[PDB]
Amino acid sequence: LEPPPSTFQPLCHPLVEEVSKEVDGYFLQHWNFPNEKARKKFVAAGFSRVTCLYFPKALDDRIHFACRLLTVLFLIDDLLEYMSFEEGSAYNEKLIPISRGDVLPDRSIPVEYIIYDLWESMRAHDREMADEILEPVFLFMRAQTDRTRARPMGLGGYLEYRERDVGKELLAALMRFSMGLKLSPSELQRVREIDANCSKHLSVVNDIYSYEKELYTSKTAHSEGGILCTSVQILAQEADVTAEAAKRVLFVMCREWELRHQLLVARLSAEGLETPGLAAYVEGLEYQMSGAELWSQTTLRYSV
């Protein structure tokens, strides 16, 4: 697998090591892992490492929050593959009022009190910025079990759906939270087109590196929860080529999106619309794209 050249340079949060031990340690203590093999695979994935690659400029005392949220979402993402759409939906919907703090968790159920305590701790640190992550998370959760996954999609329709399933919006809200980066509604409206383009990069890069894993899952897990829903197989079907061929083509498209990102940001600046906050934001998006790819290239989650 040979990735075409990119001009995006990845950055990792300085405290990645100590935060990793902290967050992995917490989940190894509280989360219901089935066995030792699963615990080792969990650590081998490096969910805090990818988070620190996502948000390398996160504040030192907020990066752990982001690591916890993405870690539990990664774990749930895998759980859903053994469920039907119905079971998966019931599972996520139960966590939504708990995430809001409107419903108390069952303390005997790890996922519930982990989710509850997390959001409570985030609201305690920064109430306004924490609340703005909620609905983007709920949007992502509901996309995970959407029956549209089991229906024919073209590349365009897929990317539109996958913007929710890849959690583009929650990642943006979480990035801002972790950086303490407050943006006005008008500012956010200005970078909407940039966000949409960034989403496609995130989605397809992940699709390429995680295809072998998801292929195996589709053959072994639940026929619904583990269904093969990805740009790799969509393009392979549309063009009647192998998945390996589709990856090579999609890789080139990812670099086109990197080029579009730079063009859109350059236009934003030229029109005098790139505020200091917006400048930090679009740079943050670039970190997400390059960080995700670096991790995807090396994580044992995708290679084994």
Ligand X SMILES: C=C(C)[C@H]1CC[N@@H+]2CCC[C@H](C)[C@@]2(C)C1
302 known ligand binder: yes
Q: One of 47, 54, 158, 281 is an active-site residue; which one?
A: 54
Structure tokens at 27: 């989940």
String of DSSP letters for 21-48: HHHHHHHHHHS--SSHHHHHHHHHH-HH
Catalytic residue chosen out of the listed positions 26, 31, 33, 74: 74
Residue from the set 229, 292, 299, 301 that interacts with ligand X by CB under 6 A: 292
Active site residue 257: no
State which residue, 11 or 249, has the beta carbon closest to a copy of itself: 249
185 membership: H or E segment, kind and range = helix 185-190
From the number of C-beta atoms within 10 Å of its C-beta (0-12, 13-18, 19+), residue 43 rates as middle
Does 168 qualify as catalytic in the annotation? yes
Residue 303 among known ligand-binding residues? no
Contacts of 164 (CB under 8 A, 6+ apart): 139, 140, 142, 143, 146
Asked if residue 142 binds a copy of itself (CB under 8 A), the reply is no
Measured between alpha carbons, how far apart are the two ends of the chain, in Å? 15
Q: Is 206 in the site for ligand X (CB under 6 A)?
A: yes
Q: What distance lies between CA 129 and its chain's CA centroid?
A: 18
2 is a site residue for a copy of itself (CB under 8 A): no
Q: Please list, residue by residue across 75-87, b when 16 or more beta carbons sit within 10 angstroms of its beta carbon and e when fewer do.
A: bbebebbebebeb
Partner in contact with 271, chosen from Mg ion, ligand X, a copy of itself, none, beta carbon below 5 to 8 Å by kind: none
Task: Establish if 237 lies at the interface with a copy of itself (CB under 8 A).
Answer: yes
The option from a copy of itself, ligand X, Mg ion, none interacting with 242 (CB < 5 to 8 A, set by class) reads a copy of itself
Q: Is 301 annotated as a binding residue?
A: yes
Instruction: Report the alpha-carbon distance of residue 147 to residue 161 in Å, rounded.
Output: 11
Give the nearest residue (CB) to Mg ion.
210
253 makes contact, choosing from Mg ion, ligand X, a copy of itself, none, with CB < 5 to 8 Å by partner type, with a copy of itself
Residue 230 one-letter amino acid: T
**Residue 228 lies near a copy of itself (rule: CB under 8 A):** no
Decide: is 304 part of the binding site for a copy of itself (CB under 8 A): no
Residues contacting 27, CB < 8 A, separation 6+: 42, 71, 72, 75, 114
- Is 77 annotated in a binding site? The answer is yes
* Smallest gap from residue 216 Cβ to Mg ion (A): 12
Tell me: does residue 141 bind ligand X (CB under 6 A). no
Q: Does 138 bind ligand X (CB under 6 A)?
A: no
Asked if 85 is an active-site residue, the reply is no
Which residue is listed with tokens 């390059």? 290
Asked whether position 256 contacts a copy of itself by CB under 8 A, the answer is yes
Tokens of 248: 């090579």
Site of interaction with ligand X (CB under 6 A): 70, 73-74, 77, 166-167, 170-171, 202, 206, 292
Active-site residues, by number, are 54, 74, 140, 168, 295
Q: Which residues sit in the known binding site for (2E,6E)-farnesyl diphosphate?
A: 301-302
